[PDB]
Design an enzyme around this catalytic site. Structure first.
Site, mmCIF file in Angstrom:
data_model
loop_
_atom_site.group_PDB
_atom_site.id
_atom_site.type_symbol
_atom_site.label_atom_id
_atom_site.label_comp_id
_atom_site.label_asym_id
_atom_site.label_seq_id
_atom_site.Cartn_x
_atom_site.Cartn_y
_atom_site.Cartn_z
ATOM 1 C CG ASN A 194 32.188 33.409 38.731
ATOM 2 O OD1 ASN A 194 32.645 33.388 39.883
ATOM 3 N ND2 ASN A 194 30.930 33.025 38.443
ATOM 4 C CG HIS A 215 24.906 33.191 40.794
ATOM 5 N ND1 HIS A 215 25.125 32.941 42.142
ATOM 6 C CD2 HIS A 215 26.113 33.004 40.176
ATOM 7 C CE1 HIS A 215 26.396 32.606 42.322
ATOM 8 N NE2 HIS A 215 27.026 32.684 41.154
ATOM 9 C CE1 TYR A 244 27.544 35.678 44.109
ATOM 10 C CE2 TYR A 244 29.741 35.315 43.218
ATOM 11 C CZ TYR A 244 28.632 34.837 43.890
ATOM 12 O OH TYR A 244 28.570 33.535 44.346
HETATM 13 C C1 LIG Z 1 28.925 24.436 43.499
HETATM 14 C C2 LIG Z 1 28.365 24.987 42.207
HETATM 15 O O1 LIG Z 1 28.491 24.457 41.096
HETATM 16 N N1 LIG Z 1 27.668 26.118 42.362
HETATM 17 C C3 LIG Z 1 27.297 26.947 41.246
HETATM 18 C C4 LIG Z 1 27.465 28.388 41.677
HETATM 19 O O2 LIG Z 1 28.859 28.493 41.923
HETATM 20 C C5 LIG Z 1 29.015 29.021 43.229
HETATM 21 O O3 LIG Z 1 28.867 30.446 43.253
HETATM 22 C C6 LIG Z 1 30.019 31.336 43.295
HETATM 23 C C7 LIG Z 1 30.536 31.670 41.897
HETATM 24 O O4 LIG Z 1 31.749 32.005 41.796
HETATM 25 O O5 LIG Z 1 29.769 31.631 40.878
HETATM 26 C C8 LIG Z 1 31.114 30.795 44.217
HETATM 27 O O6 LIG Z 1 30.870 32.114 45.405
HETATM 28 C C9 LIG Z 1 32.075 32.450 46.088
HETATM 29 O O7 LIG Z 1 32.379 31.330 46.930
HETATM 30 C C10 LIG Z 1 33.553 31.511 47.750
HETATM 31 C C11 LIG Z 1 33.760 30.253 48.579
HETATM 32 O O8 LIG Z 1 33.496 29.251 47.624
HETATM 33 C C12 LIG Z 1 33.442 32.777 48.622
HETATM 34 O O9 LIG Z 1 32.408 32.683 49.617
HETATM 35 S S1 LIG Z 1 32.813 32.770 51.199
HETATM 36 O O10 LIG Z 1 33.974 31.909 51.401
HETATM 37 O O11 LIG Z 1 31.565 32.152 51.977
HETATM 38 O O12 LIG Z 1 33.035 34.165 51.556
HETATM 39 C C13 LIG Z 1 33.080 33.975 47.775
HETATM 40 O O13 LIG Z 1 32.888 35.132 48.616
HETATM 41 C C14 LIG Z 1 33.384 36.351 48.386
HETATM 42 O O14 LIG Z 1 34.783 36.039 48.521
HETATM 43 C C15 LIG Z 1 35.629 37.104 48.073
HETATM 44 C C16 LIG Z 1 36.975 36.693 47.456
HETATM 45 O O15 LIG Z 1 37.300 35.455 47.475
HETATM 46 O O16 LIG Z 1 37.644 37.600 46.946
HETATM 47 C C17 LIG Z 1 35.144 38.356 48.174
HETATM 48 C C18 LIG Z 1 33.858 38.747 48.953
HETATM 49 O O17 LIG Z 1 34.149 39.516 50.150
HETATM 50 C C19 LIG Z 1 32.973 37.544 49.282
HETATM 51 O O18 LIG Z 1 31.560 37.916 49.226
HETATM 52 C C20 LIG Z 1 31.808 33.657 47.006
HETATM 53 N N2 LIG Z 1 31.444 34.880 46.328
HETATM 54 C C21 LIG Z 1 30.452 35.672 46.751
HETATM 55 C C22 LIG Z 1 30.425 37.045 46.169
HETATM 56 O O19 LIG Z 1 29.620 35.314 47.579
HETATM 57 C C23 LIG Z 1 30.768 29.472 44.907
HETATM 58 O O20 LIG Z 1 31.922 28.960 45.545
HETATM 59 C C24 LIG Z 1 30.345 28.546 43.787
HETATM 60 O O21 LIG Z 1 30.136 27.252 44.271
HETATM 61 C C25 LIG Z 1 27.009 29.325 40.586
HETATM 62 O O22 LIG Z 1 27.965 29.157 39.536
HETATM 63 S S2 LIG Z 1 28.146 30.188 38.295
HETATM 64 O O23 LIG Z 1 29.499 30.130 37.841
HETATM 65 O O24 LIG Z 1 27.184 29.772 37.095
HETATM 66 O O25 LIG Z 1 27.843 31.537 38.672
HETATM 67 C C26 LIG Z 1 25.585 28.895 40.202
HETATM 68 C C27 LIG Z 1 24.880 29.881 39.292
HETATM 69 O O26 LIG Z 1 23.520 29.530 39.041
HETATM 70 O O27 LIG Z 1 25.646 27.551 39.673
HETATM 71 C C28 LIG Z 1 25.872 26.678 40.761
HETATM 72 O O28 LIG Z 1 25.760 25.341 40.294
HETATM 73 NA NA NA Z 2 20.059 32.256 39.892
#
Ligand SMILES: CC(=O)N[C@@H]1[C@@H](O[C@@H]2O[C@H](C(=O)O)[C@@H](O[C@@H]3O[C@H](CO)[C@H](OS(=O)(=O)O)[C@H](O[C@@H]4OC(C(=O)O)=C[C@H](O)[C@H]4O)[C@H]3NC(C)=O)[C@H](O)[C@H]2O)[C@@H](OS(=O)(=O)O)[C@@H](CO)O[C@H]1O
Ligand code: NA
Length: 754
Positions: free
Chosen positions: A180, A230, A239
């Protein structure tokens, strides 16, 4: 740095994301990349909302749904990419340009502007849109006005005033970490090129430094090479790759400029190419056990993530010293050459095509994956290789969650941390060919499982709960590893099991002990659950064949071995019945991911399991897997005491490998397994060579200050290599006392002399 420096940076970014300076005329792979670029652009233009007073940009994307708002902007950036790529169908097309600009203008008016409060997923507003809108500004710099730049920069800055932080104000903003942090800094750096803001650019570059500092808890890179995102999920493969991709692009963009990344600790990130990423790359795919909820994504697979890691590594290699550059290129040439299943150039972008062609032009030879063991105790993952196979084990513990589900993804994955044994082989599509759409999520390979049905999202989303188990961990000496997991079942069934794996250069010995549960349901252990694709692969036994009819489970006769055509051998090391089922399974990716297609996939499986029955009392299992073994070699596994079980119960589990003259053990309680003892939890491998005893030892709870071994193979009077204090017990046996304070599950190697 002034106007000329900013123009040069923008031009470099456009060169990097279009490949416009590196297209080879008449090259067929470049032509295919442009065709794929053209089809995507054409698909988006077909979906343009042409309506007067429109309230969306694309007729199939609502701006009121935050994920569709992101896709609006990535389509617009893809269109700008096509418009800027020489020989693309829309290259320099003024009508297409006008439509991109109108899309950016209306998406800003209608939705994404500096007066809008976030609704829904924070990632959409702070990472999904900013990276795409920033790219579009830079691609279109010669075409957008100053007032358009002002508006779009203001929108980005409203959502992301500081890329070192994340979340909207109403939530409380926290430090952004790992992938992130990289993604937020990327969006601000590119936005800083469009707006010529050196202060924001410097701060965003400085924000990269945190992501490669070693951590001992939370998210990031651990000294053993593990990568967690996470807090509780092993995450190198998804990630970790986002982090690797974004730093490769940013390092390359800024190199040699006033904004170059100059922090010398970035060496930790370079060390991670071989220390973290390479061991979990298997023939071009990131291992499923390190990519969390992305296993549920039909179009974000282990090969999509591995291909992104290869692109990034090739891009980083350009800046490295000669020996490191050639080593990383060799690794990549190997992951490319061996992958005939999803060849990296099929559907590759123009930049990825250029890096793959540049690699082929170096003539650097493909490097094979090294045989042996790579352990990642901080994330409860281990990798093991031999000729033709790689085993990836997926454990869980009081540090590592059973699974991550979230955003409608992987809600069924709750057994994926229950001791899975992934055997990757020349069947490159094993885990990719609709495996996660069709597999039995209650009979994943290697697990022990209470047959109580569990609800989707059992134990909660985002890896918030972890099993309160005794320990999971591992050690390895030379060609042999010992891995243990105290399985506590998800869903409060009360399932408990002691699972160990003893892995040589060829065979994996799987022991299980002390199995019981509180639910009243049968418990099973899965010897394998193996995708046969559309095959009718024969299961051969001592008597003939087994499970020749789909849907009718059969029990193995008394030969104790079964060979699966196209895979290798399995053999039972106790007298427990082995149930063998040939089955046809169906499912859609929509069944495992809210975004998955509705298309029904149908796949054949071989499923082999032990049934511990209802109310097992100290249930157990013992079997082995011999990937790549012929029928002749499989028939011989149980002859000559090659794999000699020493002990398999609630105190300890241990096996001797006769040919390797090496013994491996896990200890749950103080006690002896054969002539080795431990004073507490331990993983041990030892081998005597004449008058010298070699040992590898880990303290797998990660919380004990000391551990004492009672030594095998007679008495030992000097330490030749390593640390530890020799002593003697009440019964005349030599002891070795280790200081294990803060060792974090890492292995200590010791050599003693008689
Ligand atoms: C909703 C919420 O509050 N949730 C949090 C949770 O946040 C969620 O987790 C991640 C994050 O960034 O932390 C974020 O994951 C990324 O989501 C997008 C779409 O939203 C992509 O997924 S995909 O569209 O299904 O593919 C993205 O994928 C990756 O995309 C890319 C790129 O864009 O370059 C490259 C890769 O090929 C691909 O894997 C996805 N990332 C991955 C690696 O899966 C979610 O959108 C977000 O909602 C966490 O938040 S945190 O900030 O604290 O980490 C969680 C932690 O406990 O807390 C939740 O409440
Ligand atoms: Na976790």
């Amino acid at each position: 740095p002034g106007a000329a420096e900013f123009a040069a940076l923008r031009n470099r970014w456009v060169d990097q994301i279009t490949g416009r300076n590196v297209i080879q005329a008449g090259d067929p792979d470049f032509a295919k990349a442009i065709t794929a670029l053209n089809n995507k652009a054409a698909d988006s233009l077909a979906k343009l909302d042409a309506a007067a007073g429109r309230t969306s940009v694309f007729t199939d994307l609502s701006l009121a749904k935050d994920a569709e708002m992101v896709t609006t902007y990535t389509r617009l950036s893809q269109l700008a990419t096509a418009w800027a790529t020489p020989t693309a169908a829309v290259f320099g097309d003024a009508a297409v340009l006008a439509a991109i600009k109108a899309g950016l203008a209306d998406a800003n008016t209608l939705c994404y502007n500096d007066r809008k409060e976030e609704v829904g997923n924070w990632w959409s507003w702070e990472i999904g849109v900013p990276r795409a809108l920033a790219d579009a500004m830079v691609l279109l710099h010669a075409e957008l006005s100053a007032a358009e730049r002002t508006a779009y920069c203001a929108a980005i800055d409203h959502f992301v005033p500081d890329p070192w932080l994340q979340f909207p104000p109403k939530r409380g903003k926290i430090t952004s970490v790992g992938a992130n942090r990289v993604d937020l800094c990327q969006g601000i750096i590119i936005r800083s090129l469009a707006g010529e803001d050196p202060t924001k650019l410097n701060h965003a570059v400085a924000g990269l430094s945190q992501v490669w500092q070693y951590v001992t808890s939370g998210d990031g890179i651990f000294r053993d090479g593990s990568f967690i995102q996470h807090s509780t999920t092993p995450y190198t493969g998804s990630y970790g790759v986002v982090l690797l991709t974004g730093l490769s692009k940013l390092f390359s963009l800024l190199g040699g400029t006033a904004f170059e990344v100059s922090d010398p600790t970035r060496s930790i990130f370079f060390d991670a190419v071989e220390g973290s990423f390479a061991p979990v790359m298997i023939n071009g795919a990131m291992a499923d056990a390190v990519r969390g909820r992305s296993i549920s994504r039909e179009a974000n697979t282990g090969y999509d993530l591995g291909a992104s890691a290869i692109e990034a590594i090739l891009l980083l290699a350009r800046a490295m010293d000669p020996a490191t550059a050639a080593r990383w290129r060799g690794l990549c040439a190997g992951w490319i050459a061996r992958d005939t299943y999803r060849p990296i150039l099929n559907s590759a972008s123009v930049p990825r095509t250029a890096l793959v062609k540049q690699l082929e032009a170096t003539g650097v030879a493909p490097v094979a994956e090294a045989t042996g063991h790579k352990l990642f105790p901080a994330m409860d993952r281990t990798m093991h290789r031999g000729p033709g196979w790689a085993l990836s084990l997926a454990l869980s513990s009081n540090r590592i969650a059973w699974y991550e589900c979230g955003n409608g993804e992987n809600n069924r994955g709750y057994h994926t941390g229950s001791g899975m044994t992934y055997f990757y082989t020349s069947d490159l599509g094993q885990y990719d060919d609709a495996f996660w759409a069709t597999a039995n999520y209650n009979r994943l390979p290697g697990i022990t499982v209470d047959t109580t049905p569990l609800p989707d999202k059992v134990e909660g989303q985002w890896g918030a709960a972890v099993p309160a188990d005794e320990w999971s961990g591992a050690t390895a000496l030379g060609e042999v590893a010992a891995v243990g997991q105290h399985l506590v079942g998800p869903g409060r069934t009360g399932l408990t099991a002691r699972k160990s794996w003893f892995v040589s250069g060829d065979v994996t010995v799987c022991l299980g002990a002390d199995i019981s549960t509180a639910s009243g349901a049968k418990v099973e252990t899965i010897v394998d659950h193996r995708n046969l694709h559309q095959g009718s692969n024969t299961l051969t036994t001592a008597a003939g064949t087994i499970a020749g009819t789909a849907g009718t489970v059969e029990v193995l006769g008394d030969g104790r071995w079964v060979h699966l055509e196209g895979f290798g051998g399995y053999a039972m090391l106790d007298d427990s019945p082995l149930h063998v089922l040939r089955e046809t399974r169906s499912g859609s990716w929509s069944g495992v991911n809210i975004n998955g297609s509705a298309t029904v996939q149908q796949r054949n499986f071989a499923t082999l399991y032990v049934n511990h029955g209802v109310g097992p009392v100290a249930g157990s299992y013992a079997y082995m897997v011999a990937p790549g073994a012929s029928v002749d070699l499989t028939r011989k596994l149980l002859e000559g005491n090659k794999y000699s079980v020493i002990r398999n119960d609630a105190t300890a589990q241990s096996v001797e490998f006769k040919t390797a003259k090496t013994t491996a053990a896990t200890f749950w309680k103080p006690g002896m397994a054969g002539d080795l003892g431990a004073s507490g939890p331990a993983c041990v491998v030892f081998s005597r060579h004449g008058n010298e005893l070699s040992l590898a030892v880990s303290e797998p709870t990660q919380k004990a200050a000391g551990l004492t071994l009672t030594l095998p193979e007679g008495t030992w009077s000097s330490v030749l290599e390593g640390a530890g204090t020799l002593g003697t017990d009440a019964d005349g046996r030599s002891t070795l006392t280790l200081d294990t304070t803060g060792l974090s599950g890492k292995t200590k190697l010791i050599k003693l002399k008689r």
